[model samples]
Target: PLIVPYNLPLPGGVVPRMLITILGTVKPNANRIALDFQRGNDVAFHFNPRFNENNRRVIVCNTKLDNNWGREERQSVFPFESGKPFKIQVLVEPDHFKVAVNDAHLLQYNHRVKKLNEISKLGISGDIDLTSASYTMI
Candidate 1:
């Protein structure tokens, strides 16, 4: 079974000192999951977790501008599992975004494309069942 990508509107867009929460369950046969912070056709942040890609454990972080992908930042701390529920929190700061998985600090991704407010859309896709998603500006 395939699940279509879910797009949620980020009211007032992302701002400095904000937190985004995503609650979801990984599918039993999941190969990957992705979260994208987007503005129109441009992707401010692409957070992708690959369960089986390259037979390695990692999280791929990158940005897409003008339909081209930037250099990928890979983190080897795999904090996700299949058939498990997870809580992911993303903190937006002035220069970077910090992520926590299941209440544990995961990683930080620096801003590649500036103008955080322009990232007005939150999109979730791939093999996961999303239970809740929310954002709060601090």
Candidate 2:
């Protein structure tokens, strides 16, 4: 069985000082991968690494409110490689989410969903293998 659309509820909900960790590997022939922190049906944070760009090194981060997507903020860096294992950590801040890739600080996405504690769901999808995922309330 595959967990492509892997979804889980946060045990204690999300808040400032919480860190979310995702450990996985990109598929050998992956086109993209996505990590999302959601509040019910609304997506609070959308992290997408796309391979459809001209060089496939673009990461799009945005928010979806009431089913409508906001403007996309792109980080034009290709960090993860095909058939390679990687670690991604997201630190929840008071006003933003700080993301790191393989222990390297990547970028910060400001909170569009002001209610931090409402974000209780994690959604992982696309072409990748999820080894482990967890969250710690610090």
Candidate 3:
């Protein structure tokens, strides 16, 4: 079964130094997957890994506000594969968000929209099966 657009609530919103973890498996025919940290209708962070879009070997990070997208931050070095289990950890820093995959540091995204406390939700979407998603305030 495929689970798309999985939504998780942040109890008291995000705090500085918080840690967010995601465990999931890529579908056999996966094309893409995205994780978004949102505040109401605005997105604070968009972590998108595309397997079949424009480039199949890149991770695109950006922010969204009122339906407008910010400058995309693209990183090469695809660490995901179809039909494989993966773990991703995102650390919320004062000025940036650090991401690590499978215990290896991946990339960091500076906060586009400040006010971390306003981010009260996490959204996951695309061709993948999620096993778990959780966060810890630190």
Which lDDT tens digits does candidate 1 get at residues 17-44? Answer: 8899989999997899899999889999
TM-score for candidate 2, residues paired by index? 0.94
lDDT, residue 109, candidate 1:
93
Q: Score every model by TM-score.
A: 0.94, 0.94, 0.94
Better of 1 and 3 by TM-score: 1
Best by TM-score: 1
Identify the superior model by lDDT, candidate 2 or candidate 3: 3
Model 3 ranges with Cα > 4 A deviation? 1-3
Off by over 4 Å in 2: none
Winner on TM-score between 1 and 2 is: 1
Model 1 alpha-carbon miss at residue 119, Å: 0.6
* C-alpha lDDT of residue 34 in model 1: 94
The RMSD (Cα, Å) of candidate 3 is: 1.6
